[model samples]
Target chain A: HHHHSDIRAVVYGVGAMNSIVAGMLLDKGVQIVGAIARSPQKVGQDLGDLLGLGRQLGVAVSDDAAEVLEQTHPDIAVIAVNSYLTDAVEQLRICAEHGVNAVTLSEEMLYPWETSPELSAELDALAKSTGATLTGTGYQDTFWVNMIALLMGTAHRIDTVRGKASWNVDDFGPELATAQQVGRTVAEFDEWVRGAQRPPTFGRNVLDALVADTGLTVKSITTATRPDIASAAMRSEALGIDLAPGDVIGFTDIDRIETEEGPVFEFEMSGRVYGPGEGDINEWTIEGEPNLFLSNGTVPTQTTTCTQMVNRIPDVIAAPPGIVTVDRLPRLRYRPQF
Target chain B: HSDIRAVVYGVGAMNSIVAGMLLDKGVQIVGAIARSPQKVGQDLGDLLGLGRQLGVAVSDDAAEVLEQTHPDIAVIAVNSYLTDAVEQLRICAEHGVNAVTLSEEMLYPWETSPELSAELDALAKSTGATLTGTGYQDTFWVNMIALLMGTAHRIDTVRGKASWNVDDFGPELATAQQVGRTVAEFDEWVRGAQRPPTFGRNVLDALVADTGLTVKSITTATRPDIASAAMRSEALGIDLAPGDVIGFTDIDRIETEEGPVFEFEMSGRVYGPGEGDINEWTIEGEPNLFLSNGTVPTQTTTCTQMVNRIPDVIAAPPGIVTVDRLPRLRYRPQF
Candidate 1:
């Protein structure tokens, strides 16, 4: 915990996602150099106001993009926006052009080389040319995937890498409830799967990312999706609705990535998660050297998502220019910037 | 996650921690070497009390492992006395294995063993490897202290306080060995007057090297924390009566042509942290940075530091590397 660095950061989006990041970073030694807000209500407001700090943190929210990027140059920008690659590309490209590194709260952006290869290469190259570094990360960074990978540094004879995680829909907000069709009929759930709106790929990414950390060349990651229906009709609890059996209460996505010689990893994500409490757990069993069973417990979602980005800031700032993922850079730790 | 195979040299208490922790961190413990016949032929994992068998057994035959595996690195937790360390180091150098050690004196050997360090660098470079030494203070004493100096426009002095409640004796002995349990030893040792805290000097010199501070000699003075009566240890060994030595605080200093610059205290005592240790440092500078925490638990921290540095050492331009010379060393929170 003994490390120290005074940081200057630009919070690019004052959404619920990044506002948590901005607010937490201030308490953890990072200075808010600039704040960019998309909401009309947030603009011209003090950062403290936006995050409900009651007073001011001095840095005010502004709608101006070019003005800040080229003027009060910051060490990096924390972008939290839509998951689609195109949605955040302009903000990312602008950061690159200005030589400021960027970390985004996008799941797929965390590892887009395979999913959006050309765009990934383009951004990586742009980041390189501008001498800035950019990459994607979010609550999923370690939650859906490799906190186990970090723990895997200690494991041996790694046979199967499996992780199961469940989250309260409310803590992450209602958006997830809609995404999982929390109160929908199974008919509606099946209907959405058949359409082109796109099902979530976080579970698949977890499978890919976790296996990649095992040093095993994954042959393929196969994922299966299903709904975790409400067991009985009820009301007066979370979501506060009269529910029925077969109601789409939550969703479960299971994934497995196999290598030629071994089953490298497995990933599971069940949201509006069924658990004793908010839950996340990863289990690893060795087929190789000498491991009994190893598992990674979960940290809080919003706080972990926020803290991890804060942890990455120093490393990303010191890293070579490129759109790098966690894997491509030096290790980040829970240390103070002494 | 390419296998960062590391040989555990000096399967002593601390190196065992380093080795076991590395395997726990998913580093392949390629080989384990030790001085004890009893430790030899034991499963490396079992030797570590890991309950599972590592298959890589502990052996006294270091030469054989070095020849066969050519492990990516060697985690040296050998004795602090440098002569033997120099020998083990040369072997690692010849094997072309990057080295990360938990040797206390090795923390900053250039301060005490300048020529030996130069020789170590040459040997490591000849084989294209690196030699790094870390311990409880790698994070704060050297790293964090130097970091505060980075942003400082004005500077004064620095002080570091560390407390350890020792429930056991085998864990810390060198300092204990010197402790005078009777009038005999403390007087015998203290007569030297210049009992420099190479422990303190190590980090001080590291601070100087890191900040590129140009200075001359770094000096030291000792203040002893003596026991009014003898002590007894149920945990390990020894019993003593009045006038025995408890511990001593060695103050290390460095200054520029202007005036005195840095002051450091390295303290070791019989009574230490009960559950764990605490570290805090104050950088008396413009906008001084302050931090304190029991974060540097030796068993947990030792291996992580070694494992985390495997990649950097492999990639380093072949030679000596210090905590201050590189980016802040952190345990990757994610893959």
Candidate 2:
């Protein structure tokens, strides 16, 4: 059965997470007409080769995100830049002005309407006026906290809601030793960070967006950081030899927002970069009228959920031309056999 | 157990009970050490009002008692002026005596002075003597609690606040000023003299270094002298006009590095105005735990129990240590 092409797609910031999403799109035979990267090194390279696929997919990567969106005239653009959420919004707005529907991994924009209410309203109006769709999606952004709220279903009186995602990965490794080369052991690294004041990076923003989405009127958001160091008899090229005492650093940041309403939103994210410990991926606990705990392993579980939710983009575009949360859309059986 | 003869070092309020507890536990009191001449030759049991004398006289000279009586362990019950206690302990250790003290200064020597601590460590090692800085607030309640909760998960940051009301200084601290225990005197005793002779620096340095963070910065906030009738009369026990204020002290230590940060702040009111104020001891880690209890008496009592465990610690291993090195007790006291 042949299907008529309905929409064209473009992807910007082709990193690992987005690279997987791009691959899924290509497998589905979707029209990903163009790709963009910030680095000149990635520009003019075949999209497939850039993503580690040996064969060329016929699309060349472009350096200019906004220029590519304007030239290609894709029906939908996926902004996948991990560190450039603010930059993604600027480019997504350009796409909206050109009447191109946009989806982003800019998880911050999920509740932009709450955090920056005026900007979110302006973006909403921009998309509505231009007849385009704009949204932010990720497992934590769309599923974790929202799913907990959905499970509660407004049937009973709610008191407090706490969501936590924990994992121990031997991969990503310790940032202080591996990244900074401070020569401090994992235990010392743990102690140092505990007493230091620093901003939370990456995954933490997911909880901030979730709290804003739940209509939980937050009074203040306070966070506490905890670090742990473990010993490992591992060989490292960086250390220049086989070392018996290796330090693995683990950090957990807990964000709790107090609300005047029925339920407070308590979110925590914890993970070990390297060390000897079984990975306990993500555990979400909701305590209110109904107490519930949901946990799953990290990789395949999160990746699978992300891929399945993203595959629904075509269906979402086919529906009414507006942003759609999981609750806003009708439930569909997500069976990606691959 | 009978071989472990002990002496009481501060025969004030808390030490009286501490000595009484030891007496009750059947630990023989060889003698009592006091700084005051008035308390000299007084019976330890009579001073504590335990209804009878324990047959040992309180002495003004610690060295005199250490030399004459030759006690096995010295149970120090003084204020947090650990330098004085450590000095007394040094004299005792020189005489081949092991001791436990109520000085918060010596417990966490890593946070303060290292060179002197090394010297003391060597002294204790060569003399075959043990010295422990033991107390309720620093040992059992606050820092000990932080160490215990830290074990529950991998901690990234630690923040603690210790607070207590003004009226809880009890009659002993209220009367301490009359016996020449001013805040400056207390500071000198805890920190030591300015002519490069300070000793508590080792203990303070040990406490900081134990957390593995170089002392990046320290910020302290103590209550300014506020006018109160209690300060003028009941606390000093000297009637004066209304509008008199006594200086209260509170301090916070913030430890920071490349990773998580640890912050601790403590405020104390010696004697001032109302019924006791609430003392909150809170610790935040990976999975944060906070405990809020009222009054200083509980902390005092807790420190007393911790001090009582000195023999147990000395019997374990030989090292200049802090409470963090000890296997923490699962504290479950119903308040």
Candidate 3:
């Protein structure tokens, strides 16, 4: 409806990614009706000044998500709190309970059907019951999944699809840097991995979305993780920490899914501290008929992560009520004026 | 809907490959159209060197074939420009049959051939048929580039560079590329006459249109690609000496009212040893973006996209639906 011309949105998380996304929403003419945050310092601050937007947005950040969501009843909730579905489900369920459409940057939410099927189904049914739609998108929406899927569409046969990508840990906030294991000793990182019940690697969700998109049967799924050790002294601005040689800068997860139909999907994804002249890298190669290759030279992973989230707001609003992943949505487009 | 009946609109080098791909995709070839006297009465199989008769004979009468077969779609591999493509596309439209073509201009003809494009769009709409143009350019030039643009917060300029081998398509395109001509002859032709819109212009049009930007000015510049050494144009079965024209590169630039500039430089020429096609695009803005498909397989991908797009074309609303406006292109092993 014409209401979309004046999209009302609530900044569901006043954190690293959502802060940037809030500005993009404003740049696209979306109105910020409310803001949600967990930090006491940010709980009562003006969202505009908190995001360094230079002026007050007149929208006060609140710690009670349920209250803000119920009060504002925005067209959509822009969420970027956590990367996993388990943590993301709380905010997502609150938005669904309020019948507010939600677009999130949870990596697992990009395609949580196989990884968290029951929760996805619960969220799906709950959202459908409330006439709300939920979608997960970010840099992976395009660079990892849809864009790769689109490239695969040009192939006559795909024997194996392999992708290699690396995003700078320093580009994100301390939460992500710590999540990436930056500044941890290699021994500690290994110990943590040895016993930690870690969630699925972000690449797992990426391959999941891709496999689902192409209707490929999953014959096998495997993940191999290894720490990215510092060869020299390195600094993580995101974490404000200094790394010594042999310390863990971050880690790389090699996620591979073999299809029963003969196509194998593999992604080598790394989140690590960068040295001089280093930027994000996204390169993929398809080994099959004609042997295709795609490279987005040193991509802006951080900006695009939020750009895609902001760009996805309208599609989420227009989508039918359910746990709609980015793969099933329309190709993302530039909404110069949403 | 289970069986996809298709008419091969032209038995050229490109369609020959596309026809075989269509068969492998489980599409039934109900009719074949050609203008050559030798091919008109021949079995499509014999002409394509399939080693067996397909039972369907090539006919010159597109209307008769389309009418008799009532095919769901027509796969056309014909001339590049809309002026010539209209004749074939018209028959498909009037017969209420969807059509997909490799015509370069037809890729995005609204700006270059506005009147003809409007007429064809109207005719297709009235007859409940969908007309689309796609090839290697469909993804490499338009959709993929547009997809990349979607990731940008603000784009100041979008630039693309691509090159394809002249020998990939066949004699018509080889000649169109002015293969084996002298540099002086190319320069004379460039200055002496106006040329049809370059494929690069069509590509830039699609990109600009996809972004919903207003075009302020569109300009084109051309330079002949000269052979550094002896080169061969296999499509035309010719040899080129050093300094002879291999092909040319066309730079099409679009200035948008919203301050974004889109430019594409496309080179189609005969390749020397170790030379392959290249497709690269870069965006300059808040966060610069770059895409490169190293030494792309231009010819095979062209046929692959056309064959894969059969379902999308059949399912699309009746009109001249450009690839940019169609659903995302997908890979289908069989349809």
Assess each prediction's global lDDT (C-alpha) against the native: 0.65, 0.54, 0.90
How do all models score by TM-score? Answer: 0.57, 0.44, 0.96
> For residues B193-290, what per-residue lDDT tens digits would candidate 3 score against the true structure?
55778999999999988888999998999999999887778898887899989889999999999999998899998988888899989999967999
Angstrom error of the Cα, residue A330, model 3: value is 1.4
lDDT of 2: 0.54
**Model 1 Cα lDDT, one tens digit per residue, A281-317:** 4334433332323332342455556666766777788
TM-score of chain B of 3: 0.97
Each candidate: RMSD to true structure? 10.2, 23.6, 2.2
| True C-alpha contacts between chains kept, each model in order | 0.00, 0.00, 0.81
Model 1's alpha-carbon lDDT is: 0.65
List ranges where model 2 is wrong by over 4 Å: A1-338, B1-3, B139-143, B148-156, B165-208, B221-225, B228-235, B239-243, B271-274, B277-288, B294-296, B330-335
**Model 2 Cα lDDT, one tens digit per residue, B109-162:** 644556656777777778777777655444424343433332222345555455
lDDT of 2 by residue, A159-233 (tens): 665666654333222322242222446666656666544434334455555455554556666677655444566
Candidate 1, residues B53-117: lDDT per residue as tens digits?
87887878777888988998888776564555788888888788888876666777776777888
What order do candidates take by TM-score, descending? 3, 1, 2
Model with the higher lDDT, candidate 1 or 2: 1
- What residue runs in model 1 are displaced by over 4 Å at the alpha carbon? A1-10, A28-46, A57-75, A90-100, A125-132, A142-147, A196-200, A211-216, A230-249, A261-263, A273-287, A292-298, A317-322, A333-338, B1-87, B90-335
Instruction: In model 2, state the lDDT of residue B293.
Output: 32
Q: Which candidate has the highest lDDT of all? A: 3
